Ligand binder design. Structure first.
Ligand SMILES: CC(C)(COP(=O)(O)OP(=O)(O)OC[C@H]1O[C@@H](n2cnc3c(N)ncnc32)[C@H](O)[C@@H]1OP(=O)(O)O)[C@@H](O)C(=O)NCCC(=O)NCCS
Ligand SMILES: CC(C)(COP(=O)(O)OP(=O)(O)OC[C@H]1O[C@@H](n2cnc3c(N)ncnc32)[C@H](O)[C@@H]1OP(=O)(O)O)[C@@H](O)C(=O)NCCC(=O)NCCS
Ligand SMILES: [Cl-]
Ligand SMILES: [K+]
Ligand code: NA
Ligand SMILES: [Zn+2]
Ligand SMILES: [Zn+2]
Lengths: 347, 392, 129, 347, 392, 128
C-alpha cells in the first residue's frame, strides 16, 4: 500500500585533504579551483578502510535508527564504483556483518554514481510487492581521482544506507513516487583493465549531467503533479558545487531548499554515496511533513528521481546514530604525501 | 623400565571436514579417548602431539601449547613430535618412553591434521622429501613412490594388475569402517583406468589428503589394572624406531625400507616373537607399493614374492591361515591424516586384539594375540614400529 | 581463505560463548570450557564492542605490508563482558594510554597480496565522550 | 499468481571448442576430463561479440516472444561477471538497443554466477509493487578460464533474458514464490586488478556450492510446502555436469526432471547465463501446467530459488524466436590457436 | 627411573653465519660435543633434536631423517621435538626421559636454527604466537613482550632506566664469551636511545635473530663413569615442563609466567632444594622484561622488586651474595637461535658447575653446586626447566 | 634465497667430493663421509655428466608452475662415477626406459614467481 524509509545511516572517514594541498603539488591556483569547482576539501579513507567497511558502518547506523532486528532484512544491495572485489560481492560481507544472513537476497550494483539510488528502487519494489518485509540499499564509494587531473580535487570516500519498510508506524519518510531517465551516453567510463577512468571533458556537463538530471526532475514532477514550490528541500547529484547549484537554480530552487543537500564543498564527490549522504543530511534536519525532491545521476547515462515526505517518527530516530554533519566535522587533515601514501597512489 | 599399556582410544572421522575446525578435531579425539580410558582430564600427566604439517598448513608453530590451552589441561606439559608421515607413531613412542621412565603414569599420545585449510597440499607433503635435491628438481611425492614401484617391477616382475589388487581389498575393507574417508567398493579395471598421477600409479593407487584426529591413552601396566578391566587392556610389547637416507636416490636398495627391517627385527627381538605369530598388522600404504614392500620388510614374505602371493587371496578376513593387514581401509581408503595416521594404526590393533564393538564387521581372527604397526615418514627416512599383545 | 571463513562471525560481530554453569563469557568462542570441561553448557552470546585498553604498544618497524599504517598502536583490550582481545587501535600514538575506553570497528585487517582474499575484522576506536 | 514471465529469449555464439583440443595442448587425457567434469565442448564468442551483444541478442529475442512494445519496459537489469566496462553500464546499452529508453531505470548486477537471477527477483518486485508494468532481467557472460586451468574446459559465452509482467493474458509462466540463501564465503573471487580469478579448489564444492544450492532448494520447498514429486522439471547451477547431477540426485530428482536444464556438457558454464539458459530450454519444451524448480548459485556465496508454473500461452510464443537448443546446435568448431586468438588470451 | 647426567657439550658460534651451511652447523656442534663427551658416533643409541623453524625458511620438514642421514648414523632413531623458542630444552627433556626409561644409554640432544636464509624472519618468529588471534591483527612478537613490559610497569612501577640496566649487564658478560654474537659493551643511554622496535622496547632491549647449533650428550649416571672422570660429570636432578595459554590476552596475569612458576616449583621439589641454593641460572631474556619476570617466577625475588635487584646489580658475576644470572651473554648478547637456545642454556650450566676452561673469564662462584635453566616458548605458553648439580 | 647460492657449483658444474681414504666419489658433496665419517678427508671432484636411467616416472599432474612441461619425465640417474641423482629428462615419454644413457644439461629448473630468483641446474638428455 505505502512504501517508505524506516531507517537510514551514514559514514564518512576522518581524513581530509584541502584543495590547497593538491594544487600546491601540481602548480595550480587553489583559489581558482575552489571558486570554480565550489569545493574546499574532501574525505580520504584510512588505508584500513574500503567501500565494504564504509558500507558496514552505514548499514549498522541505519539499523540503529530503524530499531529492527537485522534477521528481518530480506535483501541487501550495495551500489558502488569501487567494490573491493571484481567478482566476490560486497553486499554479502555487509549482510554477514549486520547479521542479516542467511535468509536474504543480495547483489552488488554498478551504474556509476547512481548505483546507490538504483537499489533504493529495488528495495521499494520488493517491499511493496510483499516479497520481503525489509530491504537495505547502500550507496558507498572510495573514489579515485587521477593524480594530475581535476577529479583529484573532488573524488572522495563516503556511504549511506537506507532500510525500506511497508509499515506506517515504523516509517520516518514515505515514498510518493519515483521516476528514472536513462540513455546510452559515453560521457565518462572506465574499461575493465584500467585503474583510472577517462572522461569526455565538457561533454560531461550540459549534454549528460544536466540532460538527465533535469529531465528526471521534470519527469517526477509531471508524474506526481508538483512544482518547485511544492517541495521543502531538494538534493541533486554533486560532482562539484557548480553543477549542483546550476541545476537547483535552473529548476527554481532557493538556497534554503538546496543547502542541506549540498555536501561536496567539504566532503567531495562520494560517487554512489553522494545523494544518499545528501538526503541523509536533509533527514537529519527535516521536520514532519517536509517534502523532498532527490535526483541522482550516473555517468553511463542515468538519473533516479524520488518524491519523499517526512513523517512524525523522524525526531525519534535522528539521534540514535551519528548525524551526517557530525561525521563530516569530526576530521583530521593530511598533506598530499600522506594522501598518496594512504590511497596507494604510490607505485 | 616399566611395562606400558593402552587403556583408551578415540578418533574422528577422516576426510574433508570443513565445518569441523582443527580444535573440534583434537577435542573430539581427546574426549573420545578419555571416555574409553575412563580417566578424568586431571588424570592426564602429560601429552605428546603428532603434527607433520604444523606451520606449513595453517601458519602456526607451537601447536602443543595451543592444543593444551584449548583442551583446558594447562599446566600439564604438552610436547610436539615431528617425523613427517610417521609423527603419530613417534608421539606414541615418546609417550611410551615417558611412562616407562616413571615420570608420568598416564600420558596421552595424539595426532591431528588439517590439510583442507590450504589451497595446495602438494607443496607441504613434498616438504618430507629432500627440498634441495628431490623437490627442487620436480620430484613430487607420488613420483618418488612411482619410481620405487617401477624399480620393484623391474627387479621382481610385479605387474600393474597385482599392484592394483591391494587397493581393491583396501576399499572392500573400508566399507566396514564408519571412520573411513571412502566407503565404496571398486574393481581392478576401475583402479587401473583411474586418472594417472605419476606413471605407473593412478589416483586409486594413492592415499588422499585428509583432515582427522586420533588419540591413545597409554598407562603403566600396574596402574592400568586399577583404571580398566584386564580384558580391555592391551600391552605395548615393543616401540622401536630406525632411520634411513632422506633422499630415495641415496638408498642402497630402493625396493626395500631398511629402517622398517631394522625397526621390525628389533621389535620381534624384544617381544621374543616371530612374524608368523602376528595375527593382524597395520602398514603405511600411502601408495600400493609401500604396502607390498612393508609386508616383505616386516617378514611376512620373502622379497619379491609378496607381490605374487598378494594375488589369489591372503591378507583378507576370509583367509584363515595368513596375517591380516589393514583391516580398516588403511591409509588408502580409511584416509591419511599425516600426524594422526600413526596413532590410528595402533588404535586399530587395540580394537582388533580387544575384539572391540568398533571393528565387529571387520574383525580379524586372532589366534596368537599379537599385532604390529609400521608407520613411515617420507619415502622411508624414518620408520616407527609398535608391537601390541593381549597378554603382558 | 578457509581459516578466515570459520571465524567470521567472531571477527565481524564479536559473537562468543557463555557458560551457564559458570556464568562466565568467553571470546573467542571455545569448544571446551577450561574450568568445567564437559560439564560446561555453552550458548552463543553477542558481545558489545565496548572495552578498555588493558595494555598497548606502538609498532615502529612492522612487516612491509603494514607500511601505510606505520607507526601503529597494537593493544590488548579488556571487553566489558570480561574477555581480552589483541587488536590494533585507530588513534594517534600520543593519544593512547591504559584504561582508554574503546569500541570495536569493522575494518580491512589484511589482504593476501594483490590477488588473494581480503580479510576483515575488528579494530578498536576511541569513544567520542 | 500476480507476477510472471511474459517473454523469454536466449543467445549462444556459434564457435565451439572440444575438450580434446584444449587437453591436447596441455598434455591431459581428454576422456578423463570429459568423464570427470561431464563436459564435451563449450561456446566461444566471436571477437566482435561480448556480454553486451549477447545480452542484446537475448533481450531482442525475449521481446519477440513477449510481443510487446519495448517502450513499455520500465527497468533493464544485466547480471554479468564480464561487463565490457568497469564503470559504464551494459544495461544502458541494452535499453538503447531495444528502444526502451529513456523512461526506465537500469543497473549492472554483480554476484558471480547468481547475478542474472538476482535481477529476475528485482523485476518481480517492481512489477508486483506496481512501480513498473514490465521489467527485463538478463543473465549473460563471456567467461574466461585461465589457460592452464580446468576452468578453461567449461568457462563459456551465453545469455538469456526474461520479461516480467502482470497480465494473465500475456504470462507464459507464473511465479509461485522465490527464496534466497546468502552467506559470506571465500570459495572463489577475483580482485579488481586481476584478469583471471583465484579459487579455493575443493572448498568450492561441498561447503559452498552444495551448501547454498541445497539450502535454497529446501527453503523454497518449505516456503511452498512442496516436495520433489510436485515438480515436473528442475534447473540448478552447472559449473560442470558432475555438480549439477549430484545436487539433483541428492534432492531426489530423476533424469527426466533435470535433463532439459543441464546444458553444460555441450555449452559449458556461461556463469550468469547458465541457469537462465537452462530455464529457457525447459520453457522451450514445457507443457501447460508444468511446475519448474530453478536454483542458481554465486560464489562469494548466494543462491536464488524459483517456483514457476507454465501457462496455456507457452506454445504460442516458443517459435517466435530461436530455441535455445537450435542456437546450441548451430555451431562451428575451432582449434586452440584460433580460440586463444579470439579470446585475446594472446599477449 | 635411572639417574641421568651430561658427559659433554658442543656449541657452534652464534649469529649471522653466512659461510656455514646448515649441515656444517649440526656437524660442527655434534663433533665438538662428541670430543668433549669422548664417545664415538657408534656409541650414540638415539638422537633427539628440536627445531621451531622446521625449515620455514628452508621449506624442509622431516629434518631429523636428514640430519641422521648426513651425520652418517643411520639406522639410529632420530626424532624432532617442537615448542617454539623452547624446542631445545624439550629435545633435552625427551633425551633425559629415554635414558631414564632404560631404552637408550647414550643419547644426543641437539638444537640447530637457520634464519639468515630468509629475507624476513619476522613472519616465522610470529608463528609461535596465536596466528588467528594475535598475528592476524598485527601483533608482532616484540609488541607482545612490549605489552607485557607496559603492564608490568603500570602494576609495579618499573622504569625504562631499570629495565635497560638488564641489557648493559648482558653485553658486559658477553664480552667474556667467544661464542657470543655481540662482544661489545654498552651504556644506559645507548640502550635507551637505540632505534625503537615496539614502545617501550628499543633495539637494545631485544635479542637478535641468529643462526647456530648446540648439542649435549646425555648418558646414564652409572655408565657416565666409563667415558668421563667423576669431576667432569654433571647430573640432571630434574627436567620439568608446564603449559600456559598460547595468547597473552588469555593469561590470568600477564606480568607472570605461570608455566615457569609451575615448572620451577616441581623442579625444586624433586631436587629437594630452595631457590636460595641456586648458584647460577640461565633464563630466557629475549626481551629483557622476560629476564626480570623469570627471576621472580623462579623465586629469586618477590613479584615487583625485580627492578631493584638489577639496578643494584645483585645478579652480576662480581656480586657474591646472590644468584648469578646469564653469565654468558644470554639471548640478548650471546644470541638467540630458537632451536639451539634451549640446549645452550644447559650447556652453560654444565660449564659453570664443572668450572670448565670455556667459561674461565665469566666463571660464577659456586657455593652449593646447583644451577637452573628456564627456556620459554612464545610469550610463555610453554616453559621447560632443567636443574643441574655437580653431586648426584 | 641464499640456499640456491650455496649449491651453485654442484647444480651448475656437477662438482662433488672424492674420498681419498675410500677412493669412492659422492655427489652432492658431503661434509662427513658416511663410511669413514671422522677418519676420512674430502677433495673436490668434477663428475662427467654421463649416466644411465636407474628408474623413472612420468608426472601427469604436477604443480601449477610446471604446466608447460606436463607430462614430464622425472628420473633417478646413476652417474658413471657411482652417485645417483634425481632430475628431469628431456625426451619423449614413450622413449624413456631403465638403462638409457643420458647426459647432464644446463637448464632453467625453476623460478620464484614473476619477480623472484631464477634457479638453474642440471637436467638430463639422451645421447645420440
Ligand atoms: C592426487 C590427488 C590430488 C588427485 O587429484 P585431485 O585434485 O584430488 O582431484 P579431485 O579431488 O578433483 O578428484 C575427484 C574425485 O576423486 C576423489 N578422490 C580424491 N583423492 C582420491 C584418492 N586418493 N583415492 C580415491 N578417490 C579420491 C574425490 O573424493 C572426488 O570424488 P568424486 O568427484 O567422485 O565425488 C588426490 O588423490 C590427493 O590429494 N592425494
Ligand atoms: C634494525 C633491525 C632490522 C636490525 O637490522 P638492520 O636494519 O640492518 O639494522 P642494524 O644492522 O644497522 O642494527 C644496528 C647494529 O646493531 C646490530 N644488531 C642487530 N640486531 C641487534 C639487536 N637485537 N640488538 C643490538 N644490536 C643489534 C646490527 O648488526 C648493526 O651492527 P653494525 O652497525 O655494526 O652493522 C632490527 O629491528 C632487528 O633485526 N631486530
Ligand atoms: Cl574431564
Ligand atoms: K566491476
Ligand atoms: Na556501471
Ligand atoms: Zn566452566
Ligand atoms: Zn669414506
Amino acid at each position: 500500500k505505502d512504501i517508505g524509509i524506516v531507517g537510514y545511516g551514514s559514514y564518512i572517514p576522518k581524513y581530509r585533504i584541502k584543495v590547497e594541498e593538491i594544487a600546491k603539488v601540481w602548480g595550480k591556483d587553489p583559489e581558482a579551483i575552489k571558486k570554480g569547482l565550489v569545493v574546499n576539501e574532501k574525505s580520504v579513507p584510512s588505508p584500513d578502510e574500503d567501500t565494504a567497511t564504509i558500507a558496514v558502518e552505514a548499514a549498522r547506523n541505519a539499523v540503529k535508527r530503524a530499531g529492527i532486528n537485522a534477521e528481518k532484512i530480506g535483501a541487501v544491495y550495495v551500489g558502488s564504483e569501487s567494490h573491493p572485489y571484481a567478482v566476490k560481492p560486497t553486499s554479502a560481507t555487509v549482510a554477514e556483518a549486520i547479521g542479516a544472513t542467511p535468509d536474504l537476497t543480495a547483489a552488488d550494483l554498478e551504474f556509476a554514481c547512481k548505483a546507490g539510488t538504483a537499489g533504493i528502487q529495488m528495495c521499494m519494489g520488493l517491499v511493496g510487492s510483499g516479497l520481503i518485509e525489509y530491504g537495505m540499499a547502500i550507496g558507498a564509494d572510495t573514489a579515485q581521482g587521477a593524480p594530475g587531473d581535476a577529479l583529484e580535487y573532488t573524488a572522495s570516500a563516503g556511504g549511506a544506507a537506507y532500510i525500506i519498510g511497508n509499515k506506517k508506524d515504523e516509517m520516518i519518510a514515505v515514498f510518493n513516487g519515483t521516476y528514472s531517465y536513462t540513455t546510452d551516453t559515453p560521457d565518462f567510463w572506465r574499461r575493465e583493465g584500467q585503474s583510472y577512468p577517462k572522461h569526455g571533458g565538457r561533454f560531461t556537463g550540459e549534454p549528460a549531467y544536466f540532460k538527465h538530471v533535469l529531465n528526471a526532475a521534470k519527469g517526477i514532477m509531471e508524474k506526481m503533479g508538483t512544482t518547485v514550490k511544492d517541495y521543502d528541500y531538494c538534493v541533486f547529484h554533486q560532482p562539484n558545487g557548480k553543477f549542483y547549484i546550476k541545476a537547483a537554480k535552473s529548476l527554481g530552487f532557493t538556497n534554503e531548499q538546496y543547502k542541506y543537500g549540498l555536501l561536496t564543498p567539504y566532503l567531495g564527490n562520494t560517487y554512489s554515496g553522494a545523494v544518499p549522504l545528501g538526503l541523509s543530511n536533509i533527514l537529519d534536519h527535516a521536520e514532519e511533513g517536509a517534502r523532498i525532491l532527490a535526483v541522482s545521476y550516473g555517468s553511463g547515462a542515468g538519473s533516479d528521481a524520488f518524491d519523499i515526505t517526512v513523517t512524525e517518527r523522524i525526531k525519534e530516530v535522528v539521534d540514535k546514530a551519528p548525524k551526517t554533519l557530525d561525521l563530516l566535522n569530526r576530521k583530521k587533515y593530511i598533506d598530499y604525501a600522506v594522501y598518496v601514501k594512504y590511497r596507494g597512489k604510490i607505485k | 623400565m616399566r611395562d606400558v599399556a593402552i587403556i583408551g582410544y578415540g578418533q574422528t572421522k577422516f576426510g574433508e571436514l570443513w565445518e569441523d575446525s582443527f580444535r573440534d578435531l583434537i577435542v573430539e579425539a581427546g574426549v573420545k579417548a578419555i571416555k574409553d580410558a575412563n580417566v578424568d582430564g586431571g588424570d592426564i600427566d602429560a601429552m605428546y602431539i603428532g603434527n607433520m604439517s604444523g606451520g606449513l598448513f595453517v601458519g602456526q608453530e607451537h601447536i602443543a601449547s595451543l592444543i593444551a590451552d584449548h583442551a583446558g589441561l594447562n599446566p600439564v606439559p604438552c610436547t610436539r613430535v615431528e617425523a613427517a608421515c610417521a609423527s603419530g607413531s613417534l608421539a606414541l613412542r615418546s609417550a611410551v618412553l615417558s611412562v616407562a621412565s616413571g615420570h608420568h603414569d598416564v600420558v596421552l599420545a595424539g595426532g591431528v591434521e588439517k590439510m583442507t585449510d590450504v589451497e595446495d597440499a602438494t607443496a607441504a607433503i613434498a616438504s618430507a622429501s629432500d627440498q634441495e635435491w628431490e623437490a627442487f628438481f620436480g620430484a613430487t611425492f607420488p613420483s618418488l613412490y612411482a619410481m620405487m614401484a617401477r624399480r620393484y617391477m623391474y627387479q621382481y616382475g610385479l605387474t600393474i594388475e597385482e599392484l592394483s589388487m591391494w587397493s581393491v581389498i583396501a576399499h572392500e575393507n573400508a566399507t566396514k569402517n564408519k571412520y573411513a574417508q571412502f566407503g565404496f567398493k571398486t574393481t581392478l579395471e576401475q583402479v587401473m583406468n583411474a586418472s594417472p598421477v605419476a606413471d605407473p600409479l593412478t589416483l586409486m593407487h594413492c592415499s588422499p589428503v585428509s583432515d582427522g584426529a586420533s588419540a591413545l591413552i597409554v598407562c603403566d601396566a600396574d596402574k592400568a589394572e586399577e583404571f580398566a578391566p584386564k580384558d580391555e587392556i592391551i600391552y605395548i610389547k615393543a616401540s622401536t624406531q630406525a632411520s634411513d637416507t632422506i633422499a630415495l636416490h641415496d638408498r642402497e636398495d630402493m625396493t626395500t625400507l631398511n629402517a622398517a627391517k631394522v625397526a621390525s627385527e628389533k621389535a620381534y627381538k624384544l617381544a621374543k616373537i616371530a612374524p608368523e605369530k602376528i595375527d593382524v598388522a597395520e602398514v603405511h600404504d600411502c601408495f600400493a607399493i609401500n604396502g607390498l614392500i612393508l609386508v616383505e620388510d616386516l617378514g611376512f614374505c620373502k622379497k619379491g614374492d609378496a607381490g605374487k602371493v598378494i594375488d589369489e587371496g591372503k591378507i583378507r578376513i576370509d583367509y584363515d591361515d595368513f596375517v591380516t593387514v589393514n583391516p580398516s581401509g588403511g591409509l588408502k581408503a580409511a584416509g591419511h591424516a599425516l600426524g594422526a595416521t600413526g596413532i590410528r594404526q595402533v588404535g586399530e590393533l587395540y580394537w582388533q586384539l580387544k575384539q572391540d564393538k568398533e571393528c565387529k564387521d571387520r574383525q580379524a581372527t586372532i589366534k596368537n594375540g599379537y599385532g604390529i604397526a609400521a608407520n613411515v615418514g617420507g619415502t622411508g627416512g624414518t620408520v616407527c614400529v609398535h608391537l601390541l599383545s593381549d597378554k603382558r | 581463505v578457509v581459516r578466515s571463513w570459520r571465524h567470521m562471525k567472531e571477527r565481524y560481530n564479536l559473537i562468543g560463548t557463555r557458560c551457564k554453569t559458570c556464568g562466565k563469557v568467553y571470546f573467542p568462542s571455545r569448544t571446551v570450557c577450561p574450568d568445567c570441561r564437559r560439564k560446561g553448557e555453552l550458548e552463543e552470546f553477542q558481545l558489545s564492542g565496548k572495552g578498555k585498553i588493558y595494555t598497548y604498544s606502538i609498532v615502529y618497524a612492522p612487516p612491509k605490508e603494514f607500511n601505510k599504517l606505520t607507526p601503529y598502536v597494537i593493544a590488548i583490550v579488556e571487553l566489558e563482558e570480561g574477555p581480552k582481545v589483541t587488536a590494533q587501535v585507530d588513534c594517534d600514538i600520543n593519544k593512547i594510554s591504559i584504561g582508554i575506553p574503546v569500541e570495536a570497528a569493522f575494518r580491512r585487517i589484511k589482504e593476501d597480496g594483490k590477488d588473494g582474499i581480503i580479510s576483515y575484522g575488528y579494530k578498536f576506536v576511541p569513544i567520542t565522550e
